[model samples]
Target: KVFGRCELAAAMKRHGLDNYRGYSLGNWVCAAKFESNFNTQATNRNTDGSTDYGILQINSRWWCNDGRTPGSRNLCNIPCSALLSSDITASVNCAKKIVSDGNGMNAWVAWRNRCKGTDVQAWIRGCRL
Candidate 1:
């Protein structure tokens, strides 16, 4: 497991991720909740046969290698398994890069569907960070 909502918010604050690439910590937390329930080992197969990996659910089409997909962009240059670790440093770094690549958190379907325009403060409601 990576974090619960409260634990994640505090960690985000401690990691100086309050406003990474102009994206709020609340946004990240909200997306994390919907994406993988903060579970780092989460994986989902898309309809197109691409797989999403880890807490951020990064797609195999552009990010990591699952060893089955050919011609993956592999922009993050890490194994898909790397995203499934309890250590979120690699996942967070790759997520930052993904956001920087002009998609913002819109790169995540969960963020677009569940977090966009939502009052995400509840994600950090009691975590005195």
Candidate 2:
């Protein structure tokens, strides 16, 4: 499922991701835009041959498993496909765990390169949360 930016903002807010792990809502929104564009089914293979899953693009190297891949950490204990669901509850929960690991948004390259230090207010400009 693909969500509009505002719709995604609303959903993330409902899940308490608007301010999760001390990060601003704009940070999450900006990261999501660059990572997956609110696409639940989004996935991409990294240069290291690991894959990113879902809106946050959680990595299979540590968070989830595509099953076809061997040696996945699967620390999130979820199948990579689970991240592709329209219901983002599992994805949100997993993301929290990932952030709690202390790297924060540093785990996401997109968050670093695109969202960090950027004025991301436009991401949720018209969203009601």
Candidate 3:
């Protein structure tokens, strides 16, 4: 499922993404805007044999294990398949892990390029979240 800005915000904030790791709701929304375009089933293959999965594009080499990535950490302890669904619970949880345990929001290169140090208010504009 693909989500619009507000829809994505509502879903992400509902799953505890608002102000998570000191990032505003719009920051998370902005990450989704670029990372996966709010698509629940998005996936990207990395040059290295790892894959990015789900809305937040958590990686197989670090966040979750798909049994395909050698030396997979599976830090979130969730099946990579679970991230590819309309239900973003696993994805959101894994995102939290990435921030709290990993490289924070900078883990997503898109977030750094598009959201970091920018006026993210526009990303969450017109939303009453």
Candidate 4:
């Protein structure tokens, strides 16, 4: 399921991403925009044999386990498949684990290279919540 800009913003906010770990809702929204363009089924493979899944592009290396990534940390204890669903609960939960690991939102290079320290409010400008 592909999400609209406001759709993802609201979804993330509903799951407590609003001001989570000192990162604003807009920042999260912006990261998703650049990471996977709000695409739930998006999966990107890295040369290191890891894959990024879902809207936030949750990594399989350290966050989720696909069983294909040998020695995956699976820090979120979630299946990589879960992150590809439209619900986003697992995706958001995994994202929280990523940020909580001391990297904040920068855990995503997409965020650091694109959304970090920018005027991300535009990502959620028209959202009701």
Better of 1 and 4 by lDDT: 4
TM-score of each: 0.93, 0.94, 0.95, 0.96
Could you tell me which residue pairs clash in candidate 2?
none
Give stretches of model 1 more than 4 Å off.
Answer: none
Clash number by candidate, in order: 0, 0, 0, 0
For lDDT, the strongest prediction is 4
- Collision count of model 4: 0
lDDT of 4 by residue, 15-117 (tens): 9999998888999999999999889999999999999998889888888899999988988998899999989998888888889987687789999999887
Per residue, candidate 2 scores C-alpha lDDT tens digits across 8-51 of 88889889987787887888888888999889999898887898
lDDT of each: 0.86, 0.88, 0.89, 0.90
RMSD of each: 1.3, 1.1, 1.0, 0.8
- Backbone clashes in model 1, listed as residue pairs: none
Worst 10 contiguous positions by lDDT, candidate 3? 94-103
lDDT score for residue 56 of model 3? 88
Model 1 lDDT tens row, 1-129 = 868788878776776667898877898899988999899999999887889998889899898888887778899999999999887887888888899998788888899999999997777788878
After superposing all C-alphas onto the true structure, candidate 1 shows an RMSD in angstroms of 1.3
